[PDB]
Amino acid sequence: FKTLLPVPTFEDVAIPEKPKLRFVERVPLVPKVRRERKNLSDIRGPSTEATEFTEGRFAILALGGGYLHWGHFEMMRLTINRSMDPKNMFALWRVPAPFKPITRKGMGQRMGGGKGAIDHYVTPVKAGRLIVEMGGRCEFKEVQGFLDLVAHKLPFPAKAVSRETLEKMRKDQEERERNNQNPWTFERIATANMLGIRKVLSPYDLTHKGRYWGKFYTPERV
Amino acid sequence: KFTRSRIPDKVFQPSPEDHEKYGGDPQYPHKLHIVTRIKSTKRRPYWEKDIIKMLGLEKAHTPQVHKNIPSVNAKLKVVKHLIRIKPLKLPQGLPTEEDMANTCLKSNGELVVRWLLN
Amino acid sequence: AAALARLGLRAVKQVRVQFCPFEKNVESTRTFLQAVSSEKVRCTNLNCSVIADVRHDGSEPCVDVLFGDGHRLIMRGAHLTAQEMLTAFASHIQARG
Amino acid sequence: VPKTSLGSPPWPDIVLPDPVEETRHHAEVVGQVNELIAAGRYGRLFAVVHF
Amino acid sequence: RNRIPGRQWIGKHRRPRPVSAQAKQNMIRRLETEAENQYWLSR
Amino acid sequence: TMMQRLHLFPDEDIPEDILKNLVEELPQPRKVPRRLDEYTQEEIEAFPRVWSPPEDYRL
Amino acid sequence: FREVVEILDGKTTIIEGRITETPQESPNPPNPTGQCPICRWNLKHKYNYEDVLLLSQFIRPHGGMLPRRITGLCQEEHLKIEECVKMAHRAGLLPNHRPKLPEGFVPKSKPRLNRYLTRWSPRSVKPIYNKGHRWNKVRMPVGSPLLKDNVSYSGRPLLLYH
Amino acid sequence: GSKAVTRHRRVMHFERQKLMAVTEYIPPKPTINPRCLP
Amino acid sequence: FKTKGVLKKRCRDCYLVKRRGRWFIYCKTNPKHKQRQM
RNA sequence: CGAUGUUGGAUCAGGACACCCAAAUGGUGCAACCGCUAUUAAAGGUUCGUUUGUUCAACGAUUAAAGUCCUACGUGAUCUGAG
RNA sequence: ACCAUAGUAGGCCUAAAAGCAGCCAUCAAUUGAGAAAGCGUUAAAGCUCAACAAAUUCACCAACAUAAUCCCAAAAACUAAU
Ligand SMILES: [Mg+2]
Ligand SMILES: [Mg+2]
Ligand SMILES: [Mg+2]
Ligand SMILES: [Mg+2]
Ligand SMILES: [Mg+2]
Ligand SMILES: [Mg+2]
Ligand SMILES: [Mg+2]
Ligand SMILES: [Mg+2]
Ligand SMILES: [Mg+2]
Ligand SMILES: [Mg+2]
Ligand SMILES: [Mg+2]
Ligand SMILES: [Mg+2]
Ligand SMILES: [Mg+2]
Ligand SMILES: [Mg+2]
Ligand SMILES: [Mg+2]
Ligand SMILES: [Mg+2]
Ligand SMILES: [Mg+2]
Ligand SMILES: [Mg+2]
Ligand SMILES: [Zn+2]
Ligand SMILES: [Zn+2]
Question: What CATH number is given for C1-97 in this structure?
Answer without folding.
Answer: 3.40.30.10
